[PDB]
Design a protein around this ligand. Structure first.
Ligand SMILES: [Mg+2]
Ligand SMILES: [Mg+2]
Ligand SMILES: [Mg+2]
Ligand SMILES: [Mg+2]
Ligand SMILES: [Mg+2]
Ligand SMILES: [Mg+2]
Ligand SMILES: [Mg+2]
Ligand SMILES: [Mg+2]
Ligand SMILES: [Mg+2]
Ligand SMILES: [Mg+2]
Ligand SMILES: [Mg+2]
Ligand SMILES: [Mg+2]
Ligand SMILES: [Mg+2]
Ligand SMILES: [Mg+2]
Ligand SMILES: [Mg+2]
Ligand SMILES: [Mg+2]
Ligand SMILES: [Mg+2]
Ligand SMILES: [Mg+2]
Ligand SMILES: [Mg+2]
Ligand SMILES: [Mg+2]
Ligand SMILES: [Mg+2]
Ligand SMILES: [Mg+2]
Ligand SMILES: [Mg+2]
Ligand SMILES: [Mg+2]
Ligand SMILES: [Mg+2]
Ligand SMILES: [Mg+2]
Ligand SMILES: [Mg+2]
Ligand SMILES: [Mg+2]
Ligand SMILES: [Mg+2]
Ligand SMILES: [Mg+2]
Ligand SMILES: [Mg+2]
Lengths: 152, 206, 113, 124, 243, 51, 97
RNA sequence: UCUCUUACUUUUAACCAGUGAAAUUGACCUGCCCGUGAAGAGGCGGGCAUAACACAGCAAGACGAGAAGACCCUAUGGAGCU
RNA sequence: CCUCCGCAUAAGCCUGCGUCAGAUUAAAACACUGAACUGACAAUUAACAGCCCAAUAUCUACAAUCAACCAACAAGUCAUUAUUACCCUCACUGUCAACCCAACACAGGCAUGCUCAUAAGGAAAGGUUAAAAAAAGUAAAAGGAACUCGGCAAAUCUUACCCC
RNA sequence: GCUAAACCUAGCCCCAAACCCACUCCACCUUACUACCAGACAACCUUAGCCAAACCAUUUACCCAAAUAAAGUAUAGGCGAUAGAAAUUGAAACCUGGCGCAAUAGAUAUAGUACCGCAAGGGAAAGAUGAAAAAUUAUAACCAAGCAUAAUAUAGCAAGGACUAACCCCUAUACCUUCUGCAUAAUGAAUUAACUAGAAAUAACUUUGCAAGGAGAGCCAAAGCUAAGACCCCCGAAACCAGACGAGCUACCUAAGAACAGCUAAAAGAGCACACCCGUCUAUGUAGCAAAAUAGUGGGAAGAUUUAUAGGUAGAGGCGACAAACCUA
């Protein structure tokens, strides 16, 4: 849990148990080539290695072997319209490696667009757009500038 | 999703989170505020969907259906009635498809219409003694109903199909709560069979 | 993103669940101990003369033999009454300016109509 | 001059300033003589997750479910729903006693049990 | 803008506002007494009208005090009605010379005193005027009980007065047993005194100390709602059953 | 001595009302014609009343 | 260039208002109301200049006397500064001495 | 170094392309000689001269430009030191 | 063709020439498209360095300089025991860059290790002509200080005297 | 016709009335925005000075109890500039306003942000269409300095007299200030737009009103009393005092570190000479690379040497191998 006060552990005291955790992680495709078991996440700043270990071994049952983290510095160079700096927020990314030789490759979520729904609210307007564009593009160079409307 | 607007922000016929609105009035801008009649939220009468009557403009007297209400400047747009013309698909080599686009009308210039005689009519918010509160015509003495309009969720309830990640109706309403003086923590800790035998020692708070 | 309303639906759903369970915990604490505000604290006044709600910090040794807690000063030390008066005068200036501008806006609205 | 406005983080000072600041992670041990970190397993959070095998409940609701008016839970409603049947029953039997209330769930002091409520021994 | 109240009434308004309002009334009266002290460093005029030379007309004359300053060593022990005099001095008692600043500190001694009421020997940093006042009052205890609060000018004298008045009001086993007739003799000797007990606790207390005392009186760890609600339930069910 | 130009605008209207809203444009016409009347080839030859 | 190009919106004034019609009513009351109130007691303004004309320095002296015990700190410092300067101006500088 | 300077290379410099300052500026349609004048004249008197316009050098003049002279004096103006 | 530079560490700054799109404008002292940019996206992963020691008494005279002679003065940079207590283990932060202080893309200032010219690292010339004046160099017939306040600059390598 | 001009409204000011605010979860006195360990140290202090006395040495209204009057009286005062009471009298409870401004004005404010300075602190500028921008249309043009459309024509404070014609003909020593005197080669000004400098008493004059009385208590009076009108500038010093901020440059010191190739080494606060520190002389540069540099030539370079890190000494002072040298250009 984050933004909660932790009960102080007197020596020989009970096990610190968190029940409804407050951590939300984002699996991210890497930006450089990574080996076949490296799985890069994106975690809040108040998370550690062993918290990510127990998080992935309790909820998703994913066998993790080693976990390494680093703190990413967000940029603080963008000037606003009144020359005050806009801070892009820092975050922490974590690279875990699977235990039993299992592999993972980042899927493709966008391919491949195949859809042609019945269109009233948008595609009827697009149909009128393309029909106007196909009808009225009958301009001619031999007329020289006279309007192509009059039957005369 | 939740952006705070500048304190003098003009409303501009578009959603405030659109891209054409950010093109019109960005954070860069400051201009004269349009002084508007303040109207309480109990005497506001017309809603989005009721038949109305334009009192003045290029076509006075015509009826129609309001399709959008803008409370922050007291605006309505009657559907395809008080229009002017603009081209949509616009390029440097071709632009046509001239479309009728509406113009906003103030609440002074728009009066309600009662269904029995189809005439412009003034309205009062006469409270009904049966508990509810509906509008009552002043001159004709007839109740004007609040018209049904498809809500902003975009979902019609009768044609709704439950997906895999939507729980059903008979499970969300089933009373499972047995209220007791235990906390959720020790309740689920005795539920899952977890046992702790050592105590929590004293801790000095200051 | 295909449908971004799902994210806000999940977020305020979980905030509703958090509010429900915190209502349950606060009802239990009120029935068993008769005290709200599960984080324990006290009204104190720090060096700058402001009145603050200091929350306790869950130590292990008592406060009279804490070397770090005995360096923080919860008192007034009377050269700050002048600056407290100046802060009060500035806040009164701001409130009077707001009410006078509201009077002016009402006058302009009644001028136009 | 220096950079006054942007906030003080771990990446700024000298070699002794780095590492002493941290980012706000709850520490889980102490340093001993040989510069070693010693981990204490009672100090690391143990995520207690329940089994979701036979669970029939989804993260969204159907729109066709009816709506309800909000009634926030208060201490009086919890008392009347939890304790008042039992106290009402053994007052009808005349064996209610105002001296001993602990059989109805009332605790005089919170020091005995594991999850004490006012100092909030439990985390979340 | 303007303040509604002047700046010198904010003390009394704070006294009426919050926890100071729930102080007992005699303590607030002893705060807002504001009497003048006895003259120490200046000779007061005889009458209120003083026929003067160079015109035989009677003029009204007041006696202005001296702004005397007490360092905290005067708060630790019994001084007189005196302290330091922060002032300025012309060089040879003529105004056509320089102006120099001069301090008159009193002469301090260390004398041991006895208290017949408290039965304890105190070592005090006393000055000569308190010795003269003790000789004029025939005893240390008579001097501390007789002289009002603005004349002691020390907090230790006020604590001595509070202890003496508590000992007088309680009729405590003061000296020891095996001589209660001596207790009765000393309690009879100081009998034109001894305010009742609940007013005797608040004599000579500064405002911060009385605020702490009143806060310690109403500490009152808040009651559980369980007892209140079972009281409500048993009262409602007795009202239904007796009907 | 730190100032630049303003007014970055564009001259191509687009399909902004379907980016999202709850107001659709009330048209008053259609795209073209439904099915073309093909005239007879000798209508000028049949320019009289009938044939 | 200073001049305005387009002429301004024409300012309409209602001479038969509530105020301008009833201007000066209950003035001149003490002559023909058998002297119960003085016409200086109709004046509604600051508490310190109510029926008192004064100079510029005299107004600030009267303002420090009647009101300055409940002013703001900045305004009290500015008033002390202004009275010091106006003393130094009126009694030392100037013509006609 | 000089009698007594000369040749060569580079930078600099002149022409073409691009970007593109600063001190200064009462207005100038802004010549010479003699005399005059607040005592040293392009602007006054008498003579002389005189189609207009750039480009590259020179520093005799514009009592040339940057510093309300640092030398001298005054102030019932300051300050250091003995 | 140049290298009197460069690679790292420390200090300092905080994303500040990686990819895509805009390059119509906007900074390039000129444009290409990119060190004087606009928006979006991704990186820096510890073993390298910080983050440290349970107490009570007690112990600690023979420098360093290859430490072996010799030889010193300014007299020196490093160590424990006895008793009690002590059985869990690898958490957190930094890791990018053409960069820091001088109003700047400033011939200025910047601590240590490494090869003392190189395996690193860079380009004095936007194009034409060979004007005057100016600056930096090369060479010069005969004389060799005759110039100048003064052998000031340059070239050779240079004696003796006086004052302080 | 380019640069350009113009907008009203955000707001703000002065009063009246009324006493005003401060924990959603977490963090915040250690290097604040840091979850977690044993010396507990702690506040109570005449303001001073500029200025006036034409200097200055006592002296010079600022002090926090409502008005008017007594009264500028008794009094104090290098009896002088000036300071200045008291006894006594009484002081009609309620109304949400402006002969206040409108982007160089009004609070500095769109803002205590950008930016400058280590630090205390200083501290700005600005927007303009529209009923509909989900109307990009064609209009709305017309006006300052600066330019283009459209360079010059012998001669002369730029003009006047004129003439058939602009020049050609006759006359004419720019403005303000300070000066006995300025065209003076004395000062100030490139131009345009906005902003930017006479505030008041006793006593007099005029006009009303009343009259031995005048005046809405107090005061004046041998034609006086009440009321009104009219009349007294701006910017600029070196300085003084009080409280804060600074030893990241430099002066000195403290804690623990680092560096000094090669040769001759006489043993050496030794010699030549690298790196390094300093800057004797010359030349370039002077709005420069640089608010102190570059190139050549130089002194020291195993010691009184140089230097990185942290800390300490602060202005009535610190420090100083005394240069009255340094203490953020
Ligand atoms: Mg001459
Ligand atoms: Mg001239
Ligand atoms: Mg000159
Ligand atoms: Mg001068
Ligand atoms: Mg003189
Ligand atoms: Mg003098
Ligand atoms: Mg002087
Ligand atoms: Mg001095
Ligand atoms: Mg690296
Ligand atoms: Mg510089
Ligand atoms: Mg190379
Ligand atoms: Mg080059
Ligand atoms: Mg060239
Ligand atoms: Mg020769
Ligand atoms: Mg010679
Ligand atoms: Mg030489
Ligand atoms: Mg003087
Ligand atoms: Mg402004
Ligand atoms: Mg013009
Ligand atoms: Mg002529
Ligand atoms: Mg003349
Ligand atoms: Mg003039
Ligand atoms: Mg003269
Ligand atoms: Mg001149
Ligand atoms: Mg002059
Ligand atoms: Mg000039
Ligand atoms: Mg230092
Ligand atoms: Mg040597
Ligand atoms: Mg010399
Ligand atoms: Mg040497
Ligand atoms: Mg000397």
């Amino acid at each position: 849990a984050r933004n909660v006060v932790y009960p102080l552990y007197r020596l020989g005291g009970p096990q610190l148990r968190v029940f409804r955790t407050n951590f939300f992680i984002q699996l991210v495709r890497p930006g450089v080539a990574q080996p076949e078991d490296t799985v890069q996440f994106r975690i809040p700043m108040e998370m550690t290695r062993v918290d990510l270990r127990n998080y992935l071994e309790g909820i998703y049952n994913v066998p993790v072997a080693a976990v390494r983290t680093r703190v990413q510095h967000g940029s603080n160079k963008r000037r606003d319209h009144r020359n005050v700096r806009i801070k892009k927020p820092d975050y922490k990314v974590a690279y875990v490696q699977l235990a039993h030789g299992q592999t993972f490759t980042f899927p493709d979520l966008f391919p491949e667009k195949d859809e042609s729904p019945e269109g009233s609210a948008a595609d009827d307007l697009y149909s009128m757009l393309e029909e106007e564009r196909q009808q009225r593009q009958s301009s001619d160079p031999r007329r020289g500038g006279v309007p192509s409307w009059f039957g005369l | 999703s939740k952006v705070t607007l500048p304190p003098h922000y003009r409303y501009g016929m578009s959603p405030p989170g659109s891209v054409a609105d950010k093109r019109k009035n960005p954070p860069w801008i400051r201009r004269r505020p349009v002084v508007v009649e303040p109207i309480s939220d109990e005497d506001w009468y017309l809603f989005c969907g009721d038949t109305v009557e334009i009192l003045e403009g290029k076509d006075a007297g015509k009826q129609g259906k309001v399709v959008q209400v803008i409370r922050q400047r007291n605006w309505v747009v009657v559907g395809g009635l008080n229009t002017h013309y603009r081209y949509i698909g616009k390029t440097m080599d071709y632009r046509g498809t001239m479309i009728p686009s509406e113009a906003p009308l103030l609440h002074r210039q728009v009066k309600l219409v009662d269904p029995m005689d189809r005439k412009p009519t003034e309205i009062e918010w006469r409270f009904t003694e049966a508990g509810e509160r509906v509008r009552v015509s002043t001159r004709s003495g007839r109740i004007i109903p609040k018209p049904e309009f498809p809500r902003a969720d975009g979902i019609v309830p009768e044609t709704w199909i439950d997906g895999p990640k939507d729980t059903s109706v008979e499970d969300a309403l089933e009373r499972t709560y047995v209220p007791c003086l235990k906390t959720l923590q020790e309740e689920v800790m005795e539920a899952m069979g977890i046992k702790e035998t050592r105590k929590y020692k004293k801790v000095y708070w200051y | 993103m295909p449908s971004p309303e799902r994210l806000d639906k999940v977020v305020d759903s979980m905030d509703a669940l958090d509010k429900v369970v915190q209502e349950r915990e606060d009802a239990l604490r009120l029935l068993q101990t008769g005290q709200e505000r599960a984080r324990p604290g006290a009204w104190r006044r720090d060096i700058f003369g402001r009145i603050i709600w200091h929350k306790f910090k869950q130590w292990v040794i008592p406060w009279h033999l804490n070397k770090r807690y005995n360096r923080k000063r919860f008192f007034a030390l009377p050269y700050v009454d002048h600056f407290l008066r100046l802060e009060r005068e500035k806040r009164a200036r701001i409130k009077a300016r707001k009410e006078n501008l509201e009077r002016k806006k009402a006058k302009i609205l009644l001028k136009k109509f | 001059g220096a950079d006054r406005m942007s906030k003080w983080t771990s990446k700024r000072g000298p070699r002794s300033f780095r590492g002493r600041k941290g980012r706000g992670a709850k520490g889980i041990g102490f340093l001993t003589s040989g510069w070693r970190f010693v981990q204490i397993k009672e100090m690391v959070p143990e995520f207690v997750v329940p089994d979701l095998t036979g669970f029939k409940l989804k993260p969204y609701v159907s729109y066709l479910a009816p709506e309800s008016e909000e009634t926030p839970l208060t201490a009086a409603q919890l008392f009347s729903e939890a304790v008042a049947p039992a106290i009402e029953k053994d007052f009808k039997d005349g064996t209610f006693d105002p001296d001993n209330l602990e059989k109805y769930g009332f605790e005089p002091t919170q020091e005995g049990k594991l999850f004490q409520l006012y100092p909030r021994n439990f985390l979340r | 803008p303007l303040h509604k109240y002047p700046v010198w009434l904010w003390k009394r308004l704070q006294l009426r506002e919050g926890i100071c309002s729930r102080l007992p009334g005699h303590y607030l009266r002893s705060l807002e007494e504001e009497r003048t002290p006895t003259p120490v460093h200046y000779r007061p005029h005889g009458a209120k009208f003083k026929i003067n030379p160079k015109n035989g007309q009677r003029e009204r004359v007041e006696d202005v005090p001296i702004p005397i300053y007490f360092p905290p060593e005067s708060q630790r022990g019994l001084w007189g009605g005196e302290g330091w005099i922060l002032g300025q001095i012309y060089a040879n008692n003529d105004k056509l010379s320089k102006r120099l600043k001069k301090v008159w500190k009193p002469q301090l001694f260390e004398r041991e005193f006895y208290s017949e009421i408290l039965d304890k020997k105190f070592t005090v940093t006393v000055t000569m005027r308190t010795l003269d006042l003790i000789d004029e009052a025939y005893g240390l205890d008579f001097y501390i009980l007789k002289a009002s609060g603005e004349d002691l000018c020390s907090k230790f004298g006020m604590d001595l007065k509070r202890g003496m008045l508590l000992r007088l009001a309680r009729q405590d086993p003061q000296l020891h047993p095996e001589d209660p007739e001596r207790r009765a003799a000393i309690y009879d000797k100081y009998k034109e005194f001894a305010i009742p007990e609940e007013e005797a606790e608040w004599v000579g207390l500064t405002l911060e100390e009385a605020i702490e005392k009143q806060r310690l009186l109403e500490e009152k760890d808040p009651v559980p709602l369980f007892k209140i609600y079972v009281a409500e339930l048993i009262q409602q069910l007795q009202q239904q059953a007796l009907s | 001595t730190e100032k630049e130009f303003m007014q970055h605008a564009r001259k191509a209207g687009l399909v902004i009302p379907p980016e999202k809203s709850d107001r659709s444009i009330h048209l008053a016409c259609t795209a073209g014609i439904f099915d073309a009347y093909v005239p007879p080839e000798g209508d000028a030859r049949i320019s009289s009343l009938s044939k | 260039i200073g001049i305005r190009l387009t002429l301004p919106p024409p300012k309409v004034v209602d001479r038969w208002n509530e105020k301008r019609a009833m201007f000066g009513v209950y003035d001149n009351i003490g002559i023909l109301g058998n002297f119960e109130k003085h016409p200086k007691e109709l004046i509604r303004g600051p508490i310190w200049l109510r029926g008192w004309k004064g100079n510029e320095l005299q107004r600030c002296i009267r303002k420090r006397k009647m009101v300055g015990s409940r002013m703001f700190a900045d305004d009290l410092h500015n008033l002390n500064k202004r009275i010091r300067y106006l003393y130094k101006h009126f009694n030392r500088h100037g013509k006609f001495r």
